Amino acid sequence: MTLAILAVFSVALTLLGFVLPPQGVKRATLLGLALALASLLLTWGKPFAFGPYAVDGVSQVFTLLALLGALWTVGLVRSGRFEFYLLVLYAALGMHLLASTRHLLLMLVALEALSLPLYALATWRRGQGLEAALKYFLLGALAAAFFLYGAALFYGATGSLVLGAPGEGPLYALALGLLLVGLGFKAALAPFHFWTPDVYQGSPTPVVLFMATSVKAAAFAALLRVAAPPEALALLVALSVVVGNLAALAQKEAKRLLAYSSIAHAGYMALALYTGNAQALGFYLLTYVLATGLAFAVLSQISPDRVPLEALRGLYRKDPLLGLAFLVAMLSLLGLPPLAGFWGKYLAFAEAARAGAWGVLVLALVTSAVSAYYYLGLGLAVFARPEETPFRPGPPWARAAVVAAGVLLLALGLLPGLVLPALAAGG
């Protein structure tokens, strides 16, 4: 069991870290995350259902990606406070739980499980980081409230707290909306997205990597479990796409622009929800976690506290492979062939049109074309003349990370018939 590995490592490391040096604890959390991940790969196509806990294809893929985000984020954070790894383990397990049940209340517990330690991880103790933590926490707790009242109304309109319960009339709908509020907030869909820019700009960069990838992943995994209605789906989409890209235009800072980018991207991902294909969504999030993870690793190698866009410029001269991998990431996030990001976007759009949501789809496509403004403004900016810019040219660790994960992108752009065959049930 993956849950077993995560539980064991977390509880153990809590007290073991008193007897272990911080670095040794990093080795620990790394090994544990890796073992959870490996356990996942070895049971690919097991479906293991326990109590409310249920590991199927969705749980597998989305916790694979989430664990990948935990792994990468832990890699970069040598800073010695063993809790600043522990909490990442806590969050990781929590995200797994979130992706692994249809039980509304366990889901709530999982949401708190992952989002409580993140409020703490927003602390590089920077005055701006504290602001981020505060916003994230207040808005978070309110969203929590809405999700809970939604669960109580779900249990209202049906005898269960489990999603998959048959479902009434009005009260059922009201319940689903009240759930979509909290879940949507957690995936940064409009109009529940406000926290994202402030939190991404405010939090320490590697932490932000962890958020924008793992959190979003688990969030969408949990969204697949909801019976999300066409109307609400349309609203969330249109708003998230528009606000995402358009606001992203006005951004002069890197991290914040990437936050807005993530809002638009959540918008695109929600299209898969129209059919709730999950094979599409899985693929899309594979490409997204890869490219975003890359982008944030690169943005880490510049500055943790904050990065202006000018800093990106000249990156190629400094490190050729980070320049190239960053460009590739920008193109895959653009959804431009032949890159995996294009296949993800296509696979979501495909479900939108299959569902027959045409106006929404087109809108998404138009503003997606708009998004080519800012994705290029980074990837190209790689080749510009360097402004005096901070750069710590990374360990073999991070260079091979960004490079490999980057190569994976166009690897799956050429051959999506590699990974796509089974992002499904595992066959």
Partner 1 sequence: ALFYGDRGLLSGYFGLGGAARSLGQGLARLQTGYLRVYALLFVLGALLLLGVMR
Partner 2 sequence: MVVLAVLLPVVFGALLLLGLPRALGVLGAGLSFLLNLYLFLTHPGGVAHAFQAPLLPGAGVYWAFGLDGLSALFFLTIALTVFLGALVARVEGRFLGLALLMEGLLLGLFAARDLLVFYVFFEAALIPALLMLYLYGGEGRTRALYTFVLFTLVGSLPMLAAVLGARLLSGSPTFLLEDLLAHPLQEEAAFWVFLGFALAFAIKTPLFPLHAWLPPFHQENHPSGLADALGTLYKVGVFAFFRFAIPLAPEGFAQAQGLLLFLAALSALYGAWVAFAAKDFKTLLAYAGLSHMGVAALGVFSGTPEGAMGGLYLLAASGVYTGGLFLLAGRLYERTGTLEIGRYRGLAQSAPGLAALALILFLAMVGLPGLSGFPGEFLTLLGAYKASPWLAALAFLSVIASAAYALTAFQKTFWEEGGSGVKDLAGAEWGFALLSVLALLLMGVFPGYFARGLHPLAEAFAKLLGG
Overall size of the chain counted in residues: 427
Over the window 358 to 377, marking each residue x when it contacts partner 1 by CB under 8 A and - when it does not, the resulting string is: ------------x-------
What does the CA dihedral 139, 267, 41, 54 come to, rounded to 10 degrees?
60
Q: Does 251 bind partner 1 (CB under 8 A)?
A: yes
Beta bridge partners of 48: 55
Least distance from partner 1 to the Cβ atom of residue 11, Å? 35
Q: Which does 46 bind (CB under 5 to 8 A by kind): partner 1, partner 2, none?
A: none
Measured from the CB atom, is 93 or 181 closer to partner 1?
A: 181
Enumerate residues 339-378 that contact partner 2 by CB under 8 A. Answer: 342-343, 346-347, 349-350, 353-354, 358, 361-362, 365-366, 368-370, 372-373, 376
Spell out the SS3 assignment of the chain.
Answer: CHHHHHHHHHHHHHHHCCCCCHHHHHHHHHHHHHHHHHHHHHCCCCCEECCCEEECHHHHHHHHHHHHHHHHHHHCCCCCCCHHHHHHHHHHHHHHHHHCECEHHHHHHHHHHHHHHHHHHCCCCCHHHHHHHHHHHHHHHHHHHHHHHHHHHHHHHCCCCECCCCCCCHHHHHHHHHHHHHHHHHHCCCCCCCHHHHHHHHCCHHHHHHHHHHHHHHHHHHHHHCCCCHHHHHHHHHHHHHHHHHHHHCCCEHHHHHHHHHHHHHHHHHHHHHCCCCHHHHHHHHHHHHHHHHHHHHHHHHCCCCCEHHHHCCHHHHCHHHHHHHHHHHHHHHCCCCCHHHHHHHHHHHHHHHHCCHHHHHHHHHHHHHCHHHHHHHHCHHHCCCCCCCCCCCCHHHHHHHHHHHHHHHHHHHCHHHHHHHCCCCC
Binding partner selected for residue 170 from partner 2, partner 1, none, CB under the kind-specific 5 to 8 Å limit: partner 1
Q: Which of 22, 52, 167, 229 binds partner 1 (CB under 8 A)?
A: 229
Which listed range, 37-45, 132-140, 197-205, 333-341, lies at the site for partner 2 (CB under 8 A)?
333-341
Residue number, 133 or 218, with CB nearest to partner 1: 133
Q: Which does 258 bind (CB under 5 to 8 A by kind): partner 2, partner 1, none?
A: none
Interaction with partner 1 in 87-146: which residues (CB under 8 A)? Answer: 131, 134-135, 138-139, 142-143, 146
Residues contacting partner 2: total by CB under 8 A: 28
**Residue 176 binding result from partner 2, partner 1, none, given CB thresholds of 5 to 8 Å by partner type:** partner 1
The site partner of 62 among partner 1, partner 2, none (C-beta below 5 to 8 Å per kind) is none
Binding partner of residue 177 among partner 2, partner 1, none, CB under 5 to 8 Å per kind? partner 1
How many CB atoms lie under 10 A from the CB of residue 54? 17
Q: Does position 194 bind partner 1 by CB under 8 A? A: yes
Whole-angstrom distance, CA of residue 360 vs CA of residue 240: 11
* Nearest-angstrom CA–CA distance, 123 and 203: 7
Interface mask toward partner 2 for 282-321; x: CB under 8 A: ----------------------------------------
Answer for which of 66, 74, 211, 235 binds partner 1 (CB under 8 A) is: 235
CB of 356 to partner 2, least distance (A): 8
> Which position among 162, 219, 243, 286 is part of the footprint of partner 1 (CB under 8 A)?
243
- Quick one: which of 108, 259, 416, 423 contacts partner 2 (CB under 8 A)? 416
**Per the structure block, which two tokens stand in for 420?**
């796509």
Nearer to partner 2, 5 or 352 (CB): 352
Among 191, 338, 356, 395, binds partner 1 (CB under 8 A): 191
Handedness of CA 49, 55, 57, 58 (dihedral sign): positive
Residues in touch with partner 2 (CB under 8 A): 331, 336-338, 342-343, 346-347, 349-350, 353-354, 358, 361-362, 365-366, 368-370, 372-373, 376, 380, 383, 416-417, 420
Binding site for partner 1 (CB under 8 A): 131, 134-135, 138-139, 142-143, 146, 170, 173-174, 176-178, 180-181, 184-185, 190-192, 194-195, 197-198, 229, 231-232, 235-236, 242-243, 245-251, 260, 370
